[PDB]
Enzyme design. Structure first.
Site, PDB file in Angstrom:
ATOM      1  N   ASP A   1       0.836  -1.189   0.000  1.00 40.24           N
ATOM      2  CA  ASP A   1       0.000   0.000   0.000  1.00 40.24           C
ATOM      3  C   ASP A   1       0.882   1.255   0.000  1.00 40.24           C
ATOM      4  OD1 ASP A   1       0.839   0.325   2.682  1.00 40.24           O
ATOM      5  OD2 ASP A   1      -0.939  -0.637   3.476  1.00 40.24           O
TER       6      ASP A   1
ATOM      7  N   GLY B   1      -0.509   6.129   2.781  1.00 42.50           N
ATOM      8  CA  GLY B   1      -1.351   7.289   3.025  1.00 42.50           C
ATOM      9  C   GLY B   1      -2.478   7.046   4.008  1.00 42.50           C
TER      10      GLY B   1
ATOM     11  N   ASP C   1      -7.996  -7.529   0.682  1.00 41.24           N
ATOM     12  CA  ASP C   1      -7.070  -7.677   1.803  1.00 41.24           C
ATOM     13  C   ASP C   1      -7.804  -7.309   3.087  1.00 41.24           C
ATOM     14  OD1 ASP C   1      -6.585  -4.584   1.103  1.00 41.24           O
ATOM     15  OD2 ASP C   1      -5.962  -4.915   3.169  1.00 41.24           O
TER      16      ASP C   1
ATOM     17  N   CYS D   1     -13.709 -27.439   6.552  1.00 41.86           N
ATOM     18  CA  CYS D   1     -12.417 -26.839   6.241  1.00 41.86           C
ATOM     19  C   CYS D   1     -11.356 -27.921   6.041  1.00 41.86           C
ATOM     20  CB  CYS D   1     -12.018 -25.930   7.398  1.00 41.86           C
ATOM     21  SG  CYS D   1     -10.467 -25.059   7.141  1.00 41.86           S
TER      22      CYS D   1
HETATM   23 ZN   LIG Z   1      -9.489 -25.055   9.257  1.00 46.23          ZN
END
Ligand SMILES: [Zn+2]
Ligand SMILES: [Zn+2]
Lengths: 376, 376
Positions: free
Chosen positions: A93, A96, A270, A308
């Site tokens: 970035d 600023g 992000d 997951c």
């Molecule tokens: Zn996980």
């Protein structure tokens, strides 16, 4: 040989796109989530762990790096890639935003002078100084320097900051182009401003496309406006930017923010949220976030999230992460952080796959129903 | 003001005794288990953790301390108590056992010269040199220097080592008495030898009682003879030692070894077993030892032991310690080690309480039935 910067769109569904950015240090799959990067120390996840979560690119905060250890020191150590132990692309970035939000001696059309919130020393940023520091850091994607307008902003202050930002965008463009080593090897993104005002957003888009950038960020959102207003602004702002270049929504965000932003044409994200949540005992799941300190997890043998496939969820139960976090063991926060970053990358992979298959609209509806029902 | 060394017997049951040793640095409850002490570093349990398991005294290995960092260096740092961060009593061994088992240039009636298994340097031990090194370490209980006979030993080699050990016991006595600072503030134990031979054990006991010590150790056991033979030797050897002084069985041992040795009149124990087991994934329980790596513990929400009141068992499940050990996390070995040392101290407390109440014989029978049934 890979190119300097090549964005290719493989598939579309409405406003959503999926594809790739090819750069010299690697390929970035889009839509992409960039985790916020850190120095490679014992306090943070190892870079090989971050890569194994699926991240293709990480973000460096120019403001923090120029305060400690300083950009000249990072250049002497071999650049930001050596400093962070990360050999794939890095986006920086401009610095600023943190000047407005964390530091401020002088402000004018020239640039800004500000005081380090660490040791009080004086620093200077400007289009030219920001691009030069990002050159010293050696980053692959460079952000143009702009002026942030706090939320909420009057129409007058939004017009004035947007117009200054566009003059500063041209100055960033010329500064970036003045260094052959930077211009041949890195890419430059410009930032659209204009707050919630459609005419100012269109003014900004036109000025940026006239200058010409490798990518276009939507600035001035995720600063307190609430999701409904953010989506309303994205609805008209993203179509104003050039279609064949990447669109980057800075500082966003929660998983449902990301899904809705991709529905509105955003390609890049992000957020510090996965890492901040991980250190505070909050895990993201397909059923919404959970607070692992809650007593109901003390005997729960299931992983943080049932679906997951991160390294943490293959091995660790909610009960054992609960035990580590309640004991204050750093391993607990590390596992939570790894899972949260990996969950974000798995969210991006499901977004990419569903766009490819032309079922992203349904994925987004299914995602919201389950995420907000919170049957964790 | 506490005395230099005062052993008091509060209660008896058959051959078993319970009571206290009062010394200047604190009170030792007997029967006592001494954990083997280490330098206070990040690799080992903190001394405040060892104390909180219930330990009243710890053991220092003179041989290892004289090789690294050396006794003169430990004296310069303030002595072994400062070096180990342990301000309660410390017993040091003589170094002679590790010379036989780990190091050896010369051997004679004078003493021994040996080579460091670390860096090959030459060192010397003798009754006089051992007592002087233990003075430099500043330990509270000093062991006389003797000659160990390997197992198994012929009657001739057992008689010869026992007789040399008794001449060396007198020399240790005189060396200890020659330093006013040591003799006024520390205590000295002599060591009975004689292998499995009753007449040699009686010869040794008589010689030690003629010299006169603050305490008497039974040496030459726990070196491969098996428990039945060890108990058989204790049966006649312990009654040979003076009744009103502490009896110390060096290097013992497994929990059932300890119980049976207390039944035979032993007051003091030391063993590396709790710490070695902890680092190898073995936990002691009232139902026998368990191997925490076993798959059957992966979903087991109970603590390591159902009745242990150590800090680990109040908080951590078998399942989570299993997860830490399988991942190679040092925390796993630390928790196992803390629990094992605390389990040993809880075993000693139950021994002490049951002797006090006159029910130790029943406790020992109940203990063995459950420990050997292994219904964990
Ligand atoms: Zn996980
Ligand atoms: Zn325990």
């Amino acid at each position: 040989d890979r190119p300097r910067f090549s964005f290719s769109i493989a598939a579309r569904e409405g406003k959503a796109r999926t594809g790739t950015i090819e750069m010299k240090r690697g390929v970035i799959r889009t839509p992409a989530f960039m985790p916020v990067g850190t120095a490679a120390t014992v306090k943070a996840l190892k870079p090989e762990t971050v890569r194994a979560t699926g991240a293709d690119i990480i973000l460096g905060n120019t403001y923090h790096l120029m305060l400690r250890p300083g950009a000249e020191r990072i250049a002497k150590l071999g650049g930001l890639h050596s400093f962070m132990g990360w050999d794939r692309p890095i986006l920086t970035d401009s610095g600023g935003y943190q000047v407005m939000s964390l530091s401020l001696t002088k402000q004018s059309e020239e640039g800004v002078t500000f005081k380090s919130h660490l040791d009080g020393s004086r620093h200077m940023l400007s289009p030219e100084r920001s691009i030069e520091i990002q050159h010293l850091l050696g980053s692959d994607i460079v952000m143009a320097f702009d002026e942030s307008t706090p939320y909420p902003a009057t129409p007058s202050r939004a017009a004035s900051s947007m117009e200054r930002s566009m003059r500063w965008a041209k100055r960033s463009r010329d500064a970036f182009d003045s260094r052959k080593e930077q211009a041949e090897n890195a890419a430059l993104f410009g930032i659209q401003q204009g707050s919630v005002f459609e005419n100012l957003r269109q003014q900004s888009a036109d000025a940026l496309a006239e200058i010409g950038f490798d990518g276009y960020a939507v600035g001035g959102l995720a600063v307190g406006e609430g999701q409904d207003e953010m989506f309303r602004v994205l609805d008209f702002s993203v179509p104003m930017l050039p279609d064949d270049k990447p669109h980057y929504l800075m500082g966003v965000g929660k998983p449902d923010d990301i899904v809705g932003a991709v529905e509105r044409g955003i390609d890049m994200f992000d957020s510090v949220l996965p890492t901040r949540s991980g250190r505070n005992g909050q895990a993201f799941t397909w059923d919404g976030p959970i607070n692992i300190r809650n007593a109901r997890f003390s005997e729960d043998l299931k992983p943080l999230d049932s679906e997951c496939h991160c390294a943490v969820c293959q091995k660790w139960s909610r009960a054992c992460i609960h035990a580590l976090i309640r004991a204050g063991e750093i391993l607990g926060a590390m596992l939570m952080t790894e899972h949260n970053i990996a969950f974000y990358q798995q969210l991006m992979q499901k977004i990419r796959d569903s766009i490819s298959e032309g079922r992203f609209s349904q994925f987004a509806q299914d995602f919201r129903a389950r995420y907000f029902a919170r049957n964790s």
